[PDB]
Amino acid sequence: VNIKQKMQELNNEINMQQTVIYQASQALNCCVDEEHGKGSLEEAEAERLLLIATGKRTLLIDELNKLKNEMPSKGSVTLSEIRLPLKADFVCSTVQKPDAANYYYLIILKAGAENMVATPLASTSNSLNGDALTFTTTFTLQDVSNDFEINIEVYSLVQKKSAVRTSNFALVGSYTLSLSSVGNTKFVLDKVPFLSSLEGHIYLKIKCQV
């Protein structure tokens, strides 16, 4: 409610995210061949940093634009054991043709600019358990009423195997968790692209406590 201070903090954070976007882009531009990082894990990590900062920047700008254009039980919401099932035929492909490509995934969880979290990279080559990618992340939304919403975004990168760039991580699914979600463990993703390797669901645990 202190608007000058809030605007200064949003603006400082926007500049910070733009610096990350610029520098992650430069890092990717150095990946000219194998010796120099092309097709490497570090390239995937840079793609991830770039994606996150781009997304965070967008949220901050939307919040700032809002600012400038102007009883209920409270608790925490906790998400855990996120798993992303993939189609069996795709899983078989990673097994029989493992040098074809590197497939990375990550999940972004958001409830505003203040609460935006991205999982570490997960790959089919070593996060795949059964038919599902496992993510270690736990996300906690605290002190909120029953009108809360947590937006989930699923991203994938295929690594075949200014100067500012857009991340090669592509959005391959989304879901908004709310009060009605609590206690459920299986969710049907929206916006899954045609011919995606995703089975279609995301699995997780979502719990409220005061």
Binding site: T19, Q23, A27, C30, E35, E42, A46
Partner: protein, 177 residues
């Protein structure tokens, strides 16, 4: 003559301010944690003119997964700690030395104590006293430098410019041999 310099060290130990004061003579006042950033500076040492590529790296956890992208083709390493942080000096042999030696096997290392101006600092004694710490002493630096097999040891302060040129002249001589 082109030489590539890479600078590494704990988060906020003064790597970027050192590079920017050397290359641009400006001291960046507001802290922005580095992800990946390269500069170029010209320098003449011992009558030899050298174009130094300055590769800046992240000290901070969020951003430190890219660091290996900076290591290829390195001619000289600046390995940094801050004079107001013995914890950062502590980290030299624990993590920084092993990482650098692995990625940069026979590249010479200059051990550099940053923020020299903070050795006589009311505020720093206080913070460190609470931690039981004593602001780093030149002998401690030199000793670690000898411990880790560094080509040399230098102390500087980006804020006052004191010792900066000397740091990069030494780095350049190491890169030429």
């Amino acid at each position: 003559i082109r030489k590539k310099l890479v600078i590494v060290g704990d988060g906020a130990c003064g790597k970027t301010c050192l590079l920017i004061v050397n290359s641009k003579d400006q001291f960046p006042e507001v802290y922005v944690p580095t992800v990946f950033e390269n500069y170029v500076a010209d320098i003449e040492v011992d009558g030899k003119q050298v174009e130094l590529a300055l590769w800046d790296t992240a000290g901070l956890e969020d951003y430190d997964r890219l660091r290996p992208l900076s290591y290829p083709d390195t001619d000289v390493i600046l390995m940094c700690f801050s004079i107001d942080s013995p914890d950062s000096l502590e980290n030299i042999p624990e993590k920084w030395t092993p990482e650098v030696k692995h990625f940069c096997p026979n590249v010479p290392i200059i051990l550099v104590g940053n923020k020299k101006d903070l050795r006589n600092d009311e505020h720093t004694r206080r913070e460190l006293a609470k931690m039981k710490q004593e602001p780093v002493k030149p002998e401690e630096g030199r000793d670690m430098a000898n411990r880790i097999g560094a080509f040399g040891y230098m102390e500087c302060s980006a804020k006052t410019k004191d010792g900066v040129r000397e740091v990069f002249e030494m780095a350049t001589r190491a890169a030429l041999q």
